[model samples]
Target: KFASKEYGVTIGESRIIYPLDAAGVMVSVKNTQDYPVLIQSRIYPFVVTPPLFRLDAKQQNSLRIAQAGGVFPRDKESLKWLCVKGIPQKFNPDKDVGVFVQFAINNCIKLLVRPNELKGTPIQFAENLSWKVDGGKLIAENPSPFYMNIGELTFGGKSIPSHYIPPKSTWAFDLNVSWRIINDQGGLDRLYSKNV
Candidate 1:
């Protein structure tokens, strides 16, 4: 016989944000199982308070994240990976009646760090991105202090795999007369087109 189990933990936000001038950020988490679970979080160049702890069933907790004394780029934005793991309590045959497998589930998300000084909004910068087709390649120039998270990209009705355009940098794709970058909420600018 075989059995299945759902996830034991839930994270409230899809992304974590850290402002350079602020003290820290708070992340919410919850345990959805009937039994207790141990929650563990990991991140580099940052510290998560209560990194390892046990949570009762159906209980909610908040994790505080702050910088871990490191210097980062001040001209543009930076990204890091934030991971959370949920370890279920061990099953005891004497008290528990079912045979089951136990494993940990890891939840990971992006941690975006914004610089202390930025002019205008992300949308304005995204809209102002320079798009050009040069030598059979599509180039995107980002001159702002924020990273443009592109949801979708297309050139002349052909799909392109352009994930992000970093701040103060350029990314190139293959061949485009006109381009489109769907909004990913990181930046919401207007559509772009050029006759090149």
Candidate 2:
């Protein structure tokens, strides 16, 4: 079947989700196969609509994913996952050709939710992260109210967690201690777009 892993349904910049000035983000989903496919989108810790729909073969579908508005924790950014699932329609079941075989492939993208009016972009607030090596461990103190996805915390050419640190929190990693702050270039904020 033409529904192989890489070519089923494609998204534009799946690594990040940007909020809309009026509604939500408009995402493009393209079906490159020879048959029509069912398309749907689901979000977590956040909600969007047009959750289920269909797309014709060789056709492009544009979906506007709505953002749920409510009381949110103002301290840090919310994490959510947006997934688009594609299922090929089966026809001529008697023949049982591979083309008539049905299967589902889902492309998952990350959702970084920020209030429309936060103090500043994550990049501007990332400097609050304080790093130091102490007693054979790396301690990262995050005073910001949002999670810090420091791409890599390195010291003397070594690395720390490829993780995101929560706001107003302290993260410690076991490593060669350093005298002062260490070198970390891949701040999670940068990857908020395509850092991965």
Candidate 3:
């Protein structure tokens, strides 16, 4: 059996910022392969229109995304994924091919659902994180209504792994340090190393 071409496709956006008050959002998917492809979208906690369809070679289509009937944490933003699966069709124009294996590929991106009300911007919330050394424990508190995905934190010349500090909650590290450096999750802000 011969191996057919892999599924080839591209997505329009790397990240989707969906406001709950708005109507919906649209995502574009383009077929890059020479053969026709069958496109399917997989999502949860949201709804996608025309979830399954076929596209001609090098054609593009827009997928409409809307909120599903569900309840999310209104106090903070919720994170989910939008996935696209591409299945390439047989390339036999006039000839018959036997026993060709086709492979399907999936493309996924971040989907952040935001409520109408929030205390501050994501950068501001991250910058204003309350940090304290409470009895040999490093505590980082999130005061805003956004989840802070701390990419990295540096304390006492030691590197801390990535973690998420929920909204209106506190996270603690074992090291009791005076100064701590935090890398922004979105990389929109500069690094901050504040004193205790």
Candidate 4:
């Protein structure tokens, strides 16, 4: 009552694969099995600092009591008694002082991502060409960003003004379309560090 494997016909078959970086978090999806799956990926990096803690409740109460002129009893076995009495009142006894201490602790364990160097050749394609690092430039366009009539051959040799250029034209090309960080102090450090 079932069709045989030899008689079954193998028809339309297709699959789509999308690769992403490890840092990417999936936000949404629609018709995942359909063609041309849309994926939104973040292009920036993120850094998170560790949390810090402070003193317990009992210790805080003791410190506050000591600040409010609470006297300590002298030891019965000894004539000399050690008390928190004669300490200088120059320091603040407020709990808010811990905020600065926490900040200092966090600063000691601060995590940062250094800027990367402009390495290798610029991203290149048929319609997009670029050269960067050491004051270079890049020209990118999907179709074209400039236009000229059949009679007008040469647009110009000099740098044309932005107003003169037409939007979504046949002759548009962007110059210096590149990303570069000037005076990159952490370039080399980022290259070797695992945090990068």
Candidate 5:
């Protein structure tokens, strides 16, 4: 069956929670739409400096063994020494230490429609959005209207690490943004709320 409908998405307030002593940050994306929405997210890690440990190498080798479903080698060459010594197996720097978490939305939507119908066309819609964190202790509210074009649709988000950290201390920061269709007609939906 082929049908056309006007859909509205309202992104209610959002919150981000992270540990005070965590070396990295946590991000959350919530769907407040009345209808179910499909969300595909990509997370990218950006570290100010190369990690002191080699977690990636361990992860790759672990996956290799999992796929073959067989035991792997426990040779000294296979294991790389981490800066920290005499830690628990789980606490191995090469296996457990990580630096950052970045997130991007590849493609997401709540509605399904014919591909051709959304090509080269303009539509108008509204998006009500707000953001909060740590039980509302920190908040960033959007005070402007947002818009986007159908032909120019793209979804993503990012995390940029802070340049400066106090000695013997760890810090993390995250960026959260939300968008709703405000007006698509005449291709006026080109302005984005957070265009960084």
Candidate 6:
């Protein structure tokens, strides 16, 4: 019942990313529509700033992601992705037919770049995923190397919605419903993908 903000532009999620710390993590955005907008942000590898900003109407702000100085790989966890784009300095729409006609939203969160020392922490790699029910779909394995940002996943209890799983990877999804009885939740930063 969600996912359709239409360019109102809203993004802020840094699951976990620590580059030794130099102000290397801080993202935000807002402008739920009303007018005025010119958001912009493009980060890769690292480095971020104003990059371009403007969001009045509803307004809300924040943007910062350090690490434009290099040096990463103290142990592991360097998976990346932080795309927050927007556009709509003005849009007409709503002559009658419907209403608001200005739309353009973006949100691609998950920035994990941990490094220091990791054997197991971050929810113990999501409590060491190792699900079953293969063939039909429900396989969920990950022997840890790090990387597992699933939003939700449960069995028998019913509930399935998943995403991201790298490192000694393995992921399956199908099992219409019913799973003997299982559990898994949140995009765990408490377990793996914390990059904290």
Every model's TM-score: 0.73, 0.61, 0.66, 0.14, 0.16, 0.33
Report the candidate with higher lDDT, 4 versus 6: 6
Q: Which regions of candidate 4 are displaced past 4 Å? A: 1-19, 24-140, 143-155, 160-196
Q: Write the per-residue lDDT of candidate 1 for residues 128-171, one digit (tens) a residue.
A: 67777778878888887877766556777877865677788888
lDDT of 2 by residue, 89-176 (tens): 5677577655544678997876766655657655666655666666876677778766565554556555554456666788777752
Better of 4 and 6 by TM-score: 6
- In model 1, the runs with Cα more than 4 Å from the true position are 1-13, 89-99, 131-139, 172-189
> In candidate 3, where is summed lDDT lowest over 10 consecutive residues?
176-185
Model 3, position 59, has a per-residue lDDT of: 92
- The TM-score that candidate 3 achieves is 0.66
lDDT of 5 at 144: 23
**Residues 56-170 of candidate 3: C-alpha lDDT, one tens digit per residue:** 9989999998987477777888778899989876778566655556779998877878788766566666676778888887888887677666655777767775456767787
Output the better candidate (2/3) by lDDT.
3
lDDT, candidates in the order shown: 0.75, 0.61, 0.73, 0.20, 0.27, 0.62
**Local error of candidate 3 at 7, Å?**
19
The parts of candidate 3 lying over 4 Å away from their true place are 1-13, 89-102, 130-141, 158-165, 169-187, 194-196
The number of clashing residue pairs in each candidate reads 0, 4, 0, 4, 7, 8
Q: Best candidate, lDDT-wise?
A: 1
Identify the candidate with maximal TM-score.
1
Instruction: Say which prediction, candidate 4 or candidate 5, comes out ahead on lDDT.
Output: 5
Tens-digit per-residue lDDT, 1-196, candidate 6: 6465445632222464554545567766777777898888776557667888888898889888777666666555677667777887356565544745556777666677765466755455566666667467767766776666665455665677655566566777775222111123332343222110
lDDT of 4: 0.20
TM-score sort, best first: 1, 3, 2, 6, 5, 4
Q: Provide the RMSD of all predictions against the true structure, rounded to 1 decimal.
A: 5.7, 8.0, 6.9, 31.6, 24.7, 12.4
| Pairs with backbone N, CA or C atoms under 3 Å apart (clashes), candidate 2 | 75-145, 149-188, 151-186, 191-195
Residue 122's lDDT within candidate 2 is 50
